[PDB]
Symmetry: C2
Subunit: 458 residues, 2 copies
């Protein structure tokens, strides 16, 4: 019962009020930053062994972005946390209005395998800065990363302030049935449904970052070569294991063959002729997901127009393009979460929009177009978590942009101040001086109806 | 199966994209305002018959506040809905960053009996302004109000844009199992748990406005007479049937008797010697809640120090004060939601804080004190939805203050722009010109680690 003991110890530490002190929170952020730097080599090694993640990609998407976020949160903390004076309308004078920013208490953070470090620590920064205690459940599919995370945390913080729980679905099961004050989850739709039903039993608020199939629309006005470069960048980073990676392409009939040519050329520019030898290209997390993806390769074997090679001993899957893909294809029935890119054609933008609107709202959407009005149509008519015009993936790199889904792709958002907001309850309160008395708004109300009605109607 | 047919008709109308047009939303708000004015007399009559609500109170808490909110939402709509240009950091240049405000789709609004008009239409204003279609389920405990609401809506809007569903818990059961794009609920903890478990099955985001026992702390420095006036104002408005009404009082030992004297005097000033004859005082919604409260009166019979009279034929319960109340008392085991005010004593603020912290986080908290540092302690150490220093209830009257609970008292918030925000998905997106090309951030990554690391660490 150590999980539940760890939970109630964390609650007990929150009850001491020590995490509400602003200077306490700043010091924990310093220690977190110092701790990540001390472990930088071990984190890079763990990301490399578990995901084949090269150090450039690992720094830009896991370590460096976290260090930058800690720095910003620590330096902006007084701005984010300070009670706001809120305007009070004249009719409420002499009332003064305020909003106190306060923590929820003890929160739960669940992180998946694909960015196993960043998806632990970007939520954690928000939880720390908002004044919470935290329990972290990292992915056991990346076990070296999870252990490095546990070592780092345990040697830096008390377990009753921040603790890491290693395990699989059953450890997650134990955690989500505990009355946490907030639950933050990134992962699959399947597990997200379980987390959110368990939390609902305890009236626990949640943020869910889930999945779907993110479409890329490439219309007939697009800059094909630049589109192919930015698509491949967002698609084959982390070997496609990204929730906002281009899942599939809807390309206008007239430029499909141009796009296939440009994508193939870009992949050779990126990774060379033997992509298995490229030090810039990652690997599949484990054998289960590797076989999931090679099964999809086998299903689309007649449609491969680039790549398709694999090596089980390295959990390697070559960047692969598919042509003549339909709605019936196995590759269009599941979130790919891998380096397979199916290409479907459309004749008019209305068909592309209809296709996307028939499916769950995706976490991201991308449109490549030089046509302003097509851009406007897509942003206005299709709902999705967030996206990009003439780019992919990089809308996550601005911390001033909230990152989150909608509908099946999730609820809630984070990054930057939104990470702080997510773990913050905003508490409105007023003050009215007792030296200033008036019976105007008190009973008896005889004769006051004409006055109160005129107020609400002038 | 008309409920489900009405749901899917509403979805179909949203799919026409007509509600996303800003000028469409403004026109619906105009029609809503015109419609409430046309029905003003019938709304006042229905509130009077069902809740004994006098026209002054009904205008300040239901009709007038709604008309004012419609006016503000309509005039600020372009500000609220317009896509925001968001700052982009230099390292992402030439990227341009934006946030699109877009609706969820088809939403559900559930309203309880106590403010049966305002708790329908303040959420509705937000849903309308955010560009949604809506289905409303009003309380059947106030059946005349519910019918007036249904008449008003049906004669003003198409049923596939806004529709009202009359019924009880089983109609609510049918609605909460449908895949709405958002669910907004105000009511009891019991029903809120059912709504939120049902929504969780469908990955539906929610806002829950629930309950608890809102404490008033009156310390030894308080202005006793002014405190008693502002307490009675917030407590005996709507005959105590308010989620942010003072549920119970924790008063310092040294000023308890002063407070009881002042409260009794204020009640006589408000309502006279025969409070049943006062036209400024409301009635209990129905016989079930009336008997719930007279049962509580019977339990606290030896502790009544003011009031205690009742009349079943009018569903009338006199403003009642209780003394020598303990944690064991029946009156301290449930949300009173009525005109019974128990008074408990404490010796030090630490005891009052401990008492409140042992119970679920309440929707509101009030502190009456002239001691700055006591004010700071309470706001910093106790978490609650929202509250007031030296006042009660009025923190809901500033639309610039978010209104909502935390923990057991709820999740989410509304009023003013927060009503719009609640029914809005904020969709981040970027644009990057394809005329501006660069291979600096693309593979191959040979030699780029020193550059990317220096960036994240400078």
């Amino acid at each position: 019962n150590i999980i539940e003991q760890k939970f109630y110890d964390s609650k007990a530490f929150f009850n001491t009020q020590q995490t509400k002190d602003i200077s306490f929170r700043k010091e924990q952020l310093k220690k977190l930053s110092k701790a990540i730097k001390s472990y930088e080599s071990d984190i890079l090694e763990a990301l490399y062994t578990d995901l084949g993640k090269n150090k450039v990609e690992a720094y830009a998407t896991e370590i460096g972005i976290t260090l930058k976020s800690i720095k910003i949160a620590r330096k902006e903390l007084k701005n984010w946390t300070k009670t706001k004076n809120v305007d009070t309308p004249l009719y409420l004078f002499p009332t003064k209005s305020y909003i106190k920013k306060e923590p929820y208490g003890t929160v739960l953070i669940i992180a998946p395998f694909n960015y196993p470090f960043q998806l632990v620590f970007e939520p954690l920064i928000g939880a720390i800065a908002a004044g919470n205690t935290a329990i972290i459940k990292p992915s056991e599919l990346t076990p070296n990363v999870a252990r490095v995370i546990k070592r780092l945390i345990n040697e830096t913080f008390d377990a009753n302030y921040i603790e890491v729980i290693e395990g699989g679905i059953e450890e997650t099961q134990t955690l989500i049935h505990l009355p946490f004050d907030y639950v933050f989850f990134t992962g699959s739709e399947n597990v997200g449904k379980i987390v959110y039903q368990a939390a609902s039993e305890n009236l626990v608020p949640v943020t869910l970052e889930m999945g779907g199939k993110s479409p890329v629309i490439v219309d007939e006005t697009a800059n094909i070569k630049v589109a192919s470069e930015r698509i491949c960048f967002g698609k084959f980073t982390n070997a496609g294991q990204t929730s906002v990676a281009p899942d599939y392409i809807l390309v206008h009939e007239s430029v499909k063959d141009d796009l296939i040519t440009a994508l193939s050329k870009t992949l050779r520019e990126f990774y060379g002729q033997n992509i298995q030898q490229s030090p810039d290209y990652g690997r599949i997390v484990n054998l289960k997901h590797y076989h999931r993806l090679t099964s999809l390769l086998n299903s689309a074997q007649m449609n491969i127009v680039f790549g398709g090679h694999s090596d089980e001993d390295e959990r390697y899957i070559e960047p692969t393009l598919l042509d003549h893909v339909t709605s019936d294809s196995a590759i269009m029935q599941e979130e790919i979460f891998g380096p397979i890119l199916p290409i479907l054609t459309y004749q008019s933008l209305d068909e592309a929009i209809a296709f996307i609107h028939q499916r769950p709202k995706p976490l991201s959407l991308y449109l490549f177009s030089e046509d302003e009005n097509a851009t406007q149509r897509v942003i206005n008519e299709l709902s999705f978590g967030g996206g990009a015009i003439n780019d992919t993936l990089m809308h996550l790199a601005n911390p001033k942009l909230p990152f989150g889904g909608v509908g099946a792709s999730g609820m809630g958002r984070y990054h930057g101040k939104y990470s702080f907001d997510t773990f913050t309850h905003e508490k409105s309160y007023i003050f009215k001086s007792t030296r200033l008395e008036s019976g105007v708004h008190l009973p008896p109300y005889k004769g006051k109806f004409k006055y109160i009605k005129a107020f609400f109607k002038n």
